[PDB]
Ligand binder design. Structure first.
Ligand code: HEM
Ligand SMILES: N#Cc1ccc(NC(=S)NCc2cnc3scc(C#CC4CC4)n23)cc1
Length: 371
């Protein structure tokens, strides 16, 4: 019962059935994007980017073409800026790609950098459209290097977003039940949300079968990095012919995901409060979500607190149903921390401490919401 927040009841915040091809006015863009592994390895990518003609965004008509093109030029920008991923950076992004990229990003109210809604939510397809949404029947649209495990990283994350869609559709009835004062309906709605969050934990387990720790840490993580607070581009990136000053934009982060923020909001977990670093980062990352999903989070915050409603009723059954979702959220973030230890902390030993303190802070705040 959500209206124009661009939430799908099957795939949630993910883009349903993303477009795979752009108009023929843009083959020059997509030939580069489709061959990023070979163009980067051979050292040809940067020159092809500098060889491109400046195209107009006026031939991108519908919303899906605008999102796919945003994914196409976002991966090209990452490839051009980071190159072969070994430290030799580009600090200027050529005008014939920088101007249409920023023009399209202002059109979609997104920053001109690859974000979570680009390479996870809009970077997928079904192998055969009549078989279900499972890893074996899905594939990504774009990757950076052969063996970067971008498919495993993006698809498993996407599958977690799909598993969360089952709990998102319950949100309108949680709020309807509190307003209409229906305790029994509220209890069932909370237990249904807890069940869906418990089952999303099992989807997290698939990351061990499709992502390699060395490939993720030494390759994939490099291409998703940004230029805010980064010593490699200490002043940001120069977007040619759009700004004359260098601009800083944060690297891709799953803090840009709306799924875990929307359940923090729904359950009254004030992840955005307290003035700490973690609360600061999660609020800023809302600028990197699609505006419709930004608006969905805002309206969720406007509704009455589910936590304070449950606390004020002296109802043990309602409290335990609320605690089941909070526990399910804690379990997701605890298992996720174990993944970070395996895929970042240990590879980095063979920087990583500030990341785990952020995730520990976010999990600790979730845990202290227990009633
Ligand atoms: C190899 C696998 C993974 C690694 C190494 C990893 C690592 C990280 C790191 C370093 C952060 C903090 C910096 C940032 O936000 O980008 C983070 C945040 C986050 N990641 Fe992942 N992650 C992995 C898989 C996943 C998956 C499959 C999901 C499913 C949605 C996910 C969801 C999140 C969320 C929601 C956050 C925000 C923090 C929070 O809400 O608690 N991660 N992850
Ligand atoms: N050293 C070090 C180190 C420092 C920071 C990071 N942060 C990363 S890769 N954040 C993205 C992320 C985190 N979790 C998940 S699930 C799906 C995605 C995605 C995506 C595309 C980028 C938008 N993500 C990793 C390593």
């Amino acid at each position: 019962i959500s209206k124009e927040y661009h939430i799908d009841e099957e795939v949630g915040f993910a883009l349903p059935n993303p477009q795979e091809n752009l108009p023929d006015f843009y083959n020059d863009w997509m030939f580069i994007a489709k061959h990023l592994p070979d163009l980067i390895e051979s050292g040809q990518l940067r020159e092809r980017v500098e060889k491109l003609n400046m195209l107009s965004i006026d031939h991108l008509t519908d919303h899906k073409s605008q999102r796919l093109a945003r994914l196409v030029l976002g991966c090209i920008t990452m490839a051009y800026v980071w190159g072969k991923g070994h430290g030799d950076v580009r600090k200027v992004l050529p005008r014939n790609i920088a101007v249409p990229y920023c023009q399209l990003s202002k059109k979609l109210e997104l920053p001109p950098i690859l974000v979570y809604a680009d390479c996870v939510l809009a970077n997928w397809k079904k192998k055969d459209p009549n078989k279900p949404l499972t890893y074996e029947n899905m594939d990504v649209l774009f990757s950076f290097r052969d063996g970067d495990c971008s498919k495993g990283f993006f698809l498993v994350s996407l599958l977690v977003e799909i598993a969360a869609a089952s709990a998102i559709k319950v949100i309108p009835t949680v709020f309807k039940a509190m307003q209409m004062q229906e305790r029994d309906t509220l209890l069932k709605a909370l237990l249904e949300i807890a069940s869906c969050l418990e089952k999303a934990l099992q989807v997290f387990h698939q990351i061990h079968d499709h992502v390699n720790p060395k490939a993720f840490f030494s390759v994939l993580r490099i291409y998703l990095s940004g230029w805010k607070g980064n010593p490699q581009l200490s002043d940001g990136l120069v977007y040619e012919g759009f700004w004359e000053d260098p601009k800083e934009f944060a690297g891709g982060s799953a803090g840009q995901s709306s799924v875990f923020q929307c359940f923090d909001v729904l359950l009254g977990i004030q992840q955005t409060a307290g003035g700490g670093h973690a609360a600061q980062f999660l609020q800023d990352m809302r600028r990197y979500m699609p505006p419709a999903h930004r608006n969905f989070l805002c309206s969720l915050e406007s509704n009455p607190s589910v936590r304070e409603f449950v606390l004020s009723k002296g109802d043990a059954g309602l409290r335990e149903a609320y605690d089941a979702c909070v526990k399910a959220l804690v379990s997701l973030r605890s298992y996720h921390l174990q993944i970070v230890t395996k895929y970042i902390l240990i590879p980095a030993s063979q920087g990583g401490t500030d990341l785990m303190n952020f995730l520990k802070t976010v999990r600790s705040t979730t845990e202290k919401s227990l009633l």
